[PDB]
Amino acid sequence: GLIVDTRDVEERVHVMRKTKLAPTVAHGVFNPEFGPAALSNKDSRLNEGVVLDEVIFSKHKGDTKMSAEDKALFRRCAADYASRLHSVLGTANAPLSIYEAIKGVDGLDAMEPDTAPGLPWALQGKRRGALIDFENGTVGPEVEAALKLMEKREYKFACQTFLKDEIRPMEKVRAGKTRIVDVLPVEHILYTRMMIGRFCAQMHSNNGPQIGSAVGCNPDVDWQRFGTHFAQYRNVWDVDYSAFDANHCSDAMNIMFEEVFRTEFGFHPNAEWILKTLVNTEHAYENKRITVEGGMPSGCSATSIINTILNNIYVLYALRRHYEGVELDTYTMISYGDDIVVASDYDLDFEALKPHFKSLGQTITPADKSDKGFVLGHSITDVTFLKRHFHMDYGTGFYKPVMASKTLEAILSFARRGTIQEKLISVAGLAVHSGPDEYRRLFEPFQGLFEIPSYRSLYLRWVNAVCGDAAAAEHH
Ligand SMILES: [Mg+2]
Ligand SMILES: [Mg+2]
């Protein structure tokens, strides 16, 4: 987005310095070109002259203003996608109760009891457990009061900037490209869930190419569903954005919120309002208060959904701005936030769509190098989605989500202290699709030190998960 104002204030907002990630026994074996991101300016493995503060906020270069003709086209595309979206999901989008927003419903997980409250509760030394009761699903005196200000549409807030403690490629570690988590006030998260949580639960349950959303999918079981769908198209594209959510211009965001979250689709009028508060935001980093116009904060309860919705509208927009007579059935797509796979039987020229995406402030490049740009004739077994390839399991004839071995090596190389055994069981479920030989090699350093699930047990778990009938018929 656009940094419009930078102010220095009395209160200092401390950020999480020093990593919680420590190397494992696997690190010495795989030696990954990876490591924990820089969390302080004094971290010795940074490049010289790199000021972490200017780099973590360098992603704000934009807020691209759209022309009147482009804005009207964006509205038609947002209306057309919303029309499809609410045709599949339905119009049961009434506000969640305070109780249901905290405890969750079917398709929507419960709110995290101790994960940071936001501002100004962090300055006041209050944790989430003090402001809200999470077992009984009730609210304290201040959250209750903040909800009133939101109903009246006068509520204001600040986003708390957190440095994301995560494994990053060493090249990005040295460059100081630490990602940030924009922590929003817990009451704002509560209210957003109240306003659109019902909608969110319905998208999770109805995930798939029809609504263009993979949010809430289970890759183990769903890769067969997604794989078989995209396999019947002549052309498949793996499209990468550079800084997707940072570059959502305010014009795109505003029109989207207006078209998708209308009262005529069963929404409370404040659904549009609360979402619109994400457009122009104030961010608190140490002593600095940075006002940003445009872009999406990662702290909102529905960031993945919003990004996914925008991703769908963007593709419809860029195709309509280039070709004539483009409709929703001209192509098919699946997205999870910025991650995207597009397919069509038409020989669509994705290379010429570049300046049409640029009009939204977004930069599209092919995932597979700069192969003289975008090319035709690629299939779903050539693309990547959610860091997983589409490979055929020769024993069942089902598509399986296969992660690159280098990524699995990197994931197994670091862990938070005391979580290593739990992490191994989790990663084993990801690594089983790499085959028995590769699965064995990845977990060799942990042998004797931790329980490692047998390849066999995880394969048999997968077969039943993807198709119960197939596992049942196996015992013919
Ligand atoms: Mg939460
Ligand atoms: Mg947190």
Automatic annotation (TrEMBL):
Mg(2+) 4 binds at residues 238, 339, 384. UTP binds at residues 168, 179-180, 245, 298. It is found in: Host cytoplasmic vesicle membrane; Host endoplasmic reticulum membrane; Host nucleus; Virion. It comes from the Viruses. Mg(2+) 2 binds at residues 238, 240, 339. Mg(2+) 3 binds at residues 238, 339. Residues 234-352 form the RdRp catalytic domain. Mg(2+) 1 binds at residue 115. Interacts with RNA-dependent RNA polymerase; this interaction allows 3B-3 to act as a primer. Interacts (via R-G-D motif) with host ITGAV/ITGB6. Interacts with host MAVS; this interaction inhibits binding of host TRAF3 to MAVS, thereby suppressing interferon-mediated responses. RNA-directed RNA polymerase 3D-POL replicates genomic and antigenomic RNA by recognizing replications specific signals. Covalently attaches UMP to a tyrosine of VPg, which is used to prime RNA synthesis. The positive stranded RNA genome is first replicated at virus induced membranous vesicles, creating a dsRNA genomic replication form. This dsRNA is then used as template to synthesize positive stranded RNA genomes. ss(+)RNA genomes are either translated, replicated or encapsidated. Forms an icosahedral capsid of pseudo T=3 symmetry with capsid proteins VP0 and VP3. The capsid is composed of 60 copies of each capsid protein organized in the form of twelve pentamers and encloses the viral positive strand RNA genome. Upon acidifcation in the endosome, dissociates into pentamers. Belongs to the picornaviruses polyprotein family. This is Genome polyprotein. It comes from Foot and mouth disease virus C.
